[PDB]
Amino acid sequence: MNLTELKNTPVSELITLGENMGMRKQDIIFAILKQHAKSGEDIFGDGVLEILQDGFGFLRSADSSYLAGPDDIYVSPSQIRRFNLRTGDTISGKIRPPKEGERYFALLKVNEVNFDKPENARNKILFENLTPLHANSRLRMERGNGSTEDLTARVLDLASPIGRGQRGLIVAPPKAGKTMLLQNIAQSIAYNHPDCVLMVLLIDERPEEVTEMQRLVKGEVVASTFDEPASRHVQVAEMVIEKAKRLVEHKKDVIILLDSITRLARAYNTVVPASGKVLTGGVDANALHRPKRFFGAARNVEEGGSLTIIATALIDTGSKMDEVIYEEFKGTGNMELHLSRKIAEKRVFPAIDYNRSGTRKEELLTTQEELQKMWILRKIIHPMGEIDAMEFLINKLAMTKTNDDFFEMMK
Amino acid sequence: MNLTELKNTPVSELITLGENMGKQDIIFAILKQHAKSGEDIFGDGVLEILQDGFGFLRSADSSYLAGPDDIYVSPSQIRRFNLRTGDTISGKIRPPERYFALLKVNEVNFDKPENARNKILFENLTPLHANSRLRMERGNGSTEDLTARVLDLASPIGRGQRGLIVAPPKAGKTMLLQNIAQSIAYNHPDCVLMVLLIDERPEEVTEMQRLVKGEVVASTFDEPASRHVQVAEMVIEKAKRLVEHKKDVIILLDSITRLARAYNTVVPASGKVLTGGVDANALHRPKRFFGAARNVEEGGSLTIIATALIDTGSKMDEVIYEEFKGTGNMELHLSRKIAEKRVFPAIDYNRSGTRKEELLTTQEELQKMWILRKIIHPMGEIDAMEFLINKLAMTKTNDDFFEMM
RNA sequence: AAAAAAA
Ligand SMILES: Nc1ncnc2c1ncn2[C@@H]1O[C@H](COP(=O)(O)OP(=O)(O)O)[C@@H](O)[C@H]1O
Ligand SMILES: Nc1ncnc2c1ncn2[C@@H]1O[C@H](COP(=O)(O)OP(=O)(O)O)[C@@H](O)[C@H]1O
Ligand SMILES: Nc1ncnc2c1ncn2[C@@H]1O[C@H](COP(=O)(O)OP(=O)(O)O)[C@@H](O)[C@H]1O
Ligand code: BEF
Ligand code: BEF
Ligand code: BEF
Ligand SMILES: [Mg+2]
Ligand SMILES: [Mg+2]
Known part of the structure; x- marks a missing residue:
């Protein structure tokens, strides 16, 4: 269950997949991800990191030429400080839908930093x-x-x-x-x-x-x-x-x-x-x-x-x-x-x-x-x-x- | 009854219909009097969306520039059919306020308007x-x-x-x-x-x-x-x-x-x-x-x-x-x-x-x-x-x- | 001013 994988899959398979679980394509993915979160199962996403001037950053996607995108994943500053992340780092990990008052998917735990263990990135x-x-x-x-x-x-x-x-x-x-x-x-x-x-x-x-x-x-x-x-x-x-x-x-x-x-x-x-x-x-x-x-x-x-x-x-x-x-x-x-x-x-x-x-x-x-x-x-x-x-x-x-x-x- | 069609027909062919009912003004009068009857009136052109949100159907006579016979297109109509600058629009209009207004669109780029959204x-x-x-x-x-x-x-x-x-x-x-x-x-x-x-x-x-x-x-x-x-x-x-x-x-x-x-x-x-x-x-x-x-x-x-x-x-x-x-x-x-x-x-x-x-x-x-x-x-x-x-x-x-x- | 132009 990965975000970018759902963005890559064709609409036909997305509509079918959604009907089995019980609007624009972005809404199909968003609604499917929410329903999968209700079951308690984990959700995953990925993208290249871009740290903003305020201290936080987002995981840009390749389908948007690594520019600002609707499906960008928020990366809290504390997560950046923990693994010494910098702009360009490819990040993959578990994510959650945006809560009330939020507009972006949040990053819970980073599984892979630059196709490698996160602990290897800090040093x-x-x-x-x-x-x-x-x-x-x-x-x-x-x-x-x-x-x-x-x-x-x-x-x-x-x-x-x-x-x-x-x-x-x-x-x-x-x-x-x-x-x-x-x-x-x-x-x-x-x-x-x-x-x-x-x-x-x-x-x-x-x-x-x-x-x-x-x-x-x-x-x-x-x-x-x-x-x-x-x-x-x-x-x-x-x-x-x-x-x-x-x-x-x-x-x-x-x-x-x-x-x-x-x-x-x-x-x-x-x-x-x-x-x-x-x-x-x-x-x-x-x-x-x-x-x-x-x-x-x-x-x-x-x-x-x-x-x-x-x-x-x-x-x-x-x-x-x-x-x-x-x-x-x-x-x-x-x-x-x-x-x-x-x-x-x-x-x-x-x-x-x-x-x-x-x-x-x-x-x-x-x-x-x-x-x-x-x-x-x-x-x-x-x-x-x-x-x-x-x-x-x-x-x-x-x-x-x-x-x-x-x-x-x-x- | 079409607008740009009256502009194409010679003035002689125009005065004939104008007198039976009772060049830009006599056309505007025929279209208005025809609207009083309750009959359908028509117009067309190429759409150009302004900055405010509305647009006008430019005429090929003015090289698609601003024209006195340009049809007004409400923002709701542009949003309704996802229209953008360059679309050829045809349909019924209405006499004006100094500009004609499009009632409903019949064809978007020579095809049904519903098909131009998907x-x-x-x-x-x-x-x-x-x-x-x-x-x-x-x-x-x-x-x-x-x-x-x-x-x-x-x-x-x-x-x-x-x-x-x-x-x-x-x-x-x-x-x-x-x-x-x-x-x-x-x-x-x-x-x-x-x-x-x-x-x-x-x-x-x-x-x-x-x-x-x-x-x-x-x-x-x-x-x-x-x-x-x-x-x-x-x-x-x-x-x-x-x-x-x-x-x-x-x-x-x-x-x-x-x-x-x-x-x-x-x-x-x-x-x-x-x-x-x-x-x-x-x-x-x-x-x-x-x-x-x-x-x-x-x-x-x-x-x-x-x-x-x-x-x-x-x-x-x-x-x-x-x-x-x-x-x-x-x-x-x-x-x-x-x-x-x-x-x-x-x-x-x-x-x-x-x-x-x-x-x-x-x-x-x-x-x-x-x-x-x-x-x-x-x-x-x-x-x-x-x-x-x-x-x-x-x-x-x-x-x-x-x-x- | 530079650029351009000129050379
Ligand atoms: N190795 C090659 N073999 C055959 N034709 C070539 C080769 N390299 C370039 N061409 C010709 O050059 C054209 C494209 O040139 P291009 O690579 O776009 O040059 P540039 O990138 O400098 O504009 C093609 O139509 C092709 O016929
Ligand atoms: N295929 C042709 N056969 C004969 N005369 C030609 C042809 N093409 C150009 N010319 C000559 O060129 C003149 C017009 O040139 P033009 O097409 O205006 O060139 P440009 O557009 O580059 O200024 C005409 O007077 C005509 O005599
Ligand atoms: N005395 C020399 N003998 C052999 N090769 C030389 C010599 N001087 C320069 N080169 C060649 O020039 C290249 C480097 O040029 P460089 O000294 O950087 O020129 P510049 O400083 O003007 O850019 C090297 O790859 C080398 O092969
Ligand atoms: F891509 Be080539 F320089 F026209
Ligand atoms: F039209 Be040509 F270039 F004089
Ligand atoms: F150092 Be050389 F001028 F490229
Ligand atoms: Mg090239
Ligand atoms: Mg020429």
Whole structure:
């Protein structure tokens, strides 16, 4: 008997279930929960915590993008102090219907904090105190199944490897292939790294891409399409980044696929208080501090776990603002996979700008010979043009299934 | 006895009935005297809900703006049938107090009012990539059909498509859009066709009104930017409402670049101006307007094909174009150099294109276009068109052209 | 003022 489970079940099964026990769907669930409480049986609910300024908080739900919801569960301050709860903590426990003069479900006892024992949460090392590090463990994207879509993943490993705690960017003009390459990444993460906690944050992007993502990726998808205002974009992004930090505090390897980070940066610039100083492109002088901390949240932890963030960025949009945003995030991140519109217009995919792509400290994510082979490959591709580089590399890789066999051919 | 029907009938046909009983005043007198008899009087229009809670049924004669013949709608009626701005309402009215009032509604969006309450709101409809295609080729062998045939090869269009006709001035965008309307009415009469002309030429609406088989809402450049916005808002809301009734709506906008400028001049100064003179918050609403087009899984769809300006010498139009390109999923570019050589359509094949075009084409058609894509790419834009025009001119239809390959 | 524009 769980709240969110009743919200997920179809109306047909809810009406039937209600008739057996003896109005809008929310009323069906509410009436069914009340009747189940009268029997004396226990009721359960869950959601991600958001502590208000007064000291108390609520358990936002994913069906509301972790925003204010009618079925939010009240969490008393005493409960927060007992287990040292903070914004982002996923909470599950027994709940009760609202009494006379109340408007929300109350939390009786917390059973699980971040998919773990509540006693383990009180004693922990905060995310702000975790010792950062460069990416150590390699997150190889290559399927190896010889798939035609795997070509993108294979070229990515050779151009810009990705590790746990990476802080990368898929930079390219509109219609270059950022989203689908991000989707290709999501597929390889679910297959090669089912141990990682996968999250897909969609900010100010196409609505049909939201449903396309949630029915394609094997993970959680939090979205806020361009039908939504900038105020919603920020708040939604804040909840997702904090939930990730909480899981990292439990030594979890979280991966956030953001699209787009340029849109998110514009949103912050829309809600930022005017400072009387504007940068080139119409960017507020204090607007990029928040997005820089959001992107900079991604990091590798020595104590355990990591936070990875692969976000897409826009360039050559005709607006100098997007040039400033991209360059500011490049001085913040440590990995960039560029995609060329010139290559994409020739229908050559993946339209990857090999020379401009790359990853920082890639020697910590590759073997000694793997790095030496990648080093030689770049020296050969560099003199080539953007289009010729991809047509050359794709034709060579298509001959073999894996990059390891491709390397064996080079000798 | 209908209100907007009396407004359509000539004054001569009006005076005939007016004298037997005993232009705006004589209509108001006929409706009033008819009400004295106890007989039913009728009226209609598109609803616009104000801030207080009540609304008015705007007339298509005033471009859905405020009108003396607008019908009053009480808040109880809006709540009764869960009406929202954009709903087409018809029913009995009453003589006024300086405004007619709706007695009871007979049809809500051309359907029983009770059925319009159990519907899902447009914001809750599940979006999707276009799966049903709107083949533009007529295959009649006409010279105008060439335009639609090249379009089917360069950038396919489907239900819920969100595309643009990008080109410099005098490249052939409007005449392209007119060719669109002709194919929409001839190939897909089932679709609700609308043509929204914003800040454009006055002779192009009169030419459109007679050319296209549908509705034409206009707002020439003789009108302020504030009017352009309000007119567009009304049209896009009416489209959303029809999509809520599972209708395949198609809006041919011209121009959306003019619409984006209108918003840019209306939006309050934010203290931040993007490159080209575009306010930092000026393009939000235009994005939601153009981004209204989408394919619905529950049924119906909204397709928007708008023209866009480039190479205007103004960086502003370059920012708007790139912004809409990152919002839509289809573009059909037109070259000024091809148009100056009298080569029509002046389509820039390599620049044009449609996203997820595999969901709109058969596997054979996709491969044919893929090969033809690689062959045309090395050619110059002028040499590309003159090459494709000749090959397509040899045949009446694209299917037989695919057979030559 | 900055942004924009200009360069
Ligand atoms: N002397 C060097 N030898 C090898 N690689 C270097 C050297 N200097 C910089 N790099 C490369 O540059 C990356 C880091 O650049 P960084 O010093 O952060 O530049 P910046 O400080 O200008 O951002 C590393 O991943 C490294 O591979
Ligand atoms: N398919 C066509 N066939 C012949 N002439 C055309 C065609 N398309 C455009 N034109 C020429 O272009 C002129 C109008 O261009 P227009 O459609 O207004 O371009 P834009 O809308 O980009 O300003 C007409 O005078 C016409 O001669
Ligand atoms: N790996 C790929 N294989 C084939 N087509 C691709 C690939 N990546 C992108 N595309 C093409 O790009 C279009 C979508 O581009 P998108 O990913 O939205 O770029 P962006 O996100 O930069 O706007 C699709 O229609 C698709 O045909
Ligand atoms: F149009 Be892409 F999503 F930048
Ligand atoms: F990214 Be570098 F540190 F400027
Ligand atoms: F002059 Be065109 F209508 F852009
Ligand atoms: Mg994208
Ligand atoms: Mg025109």
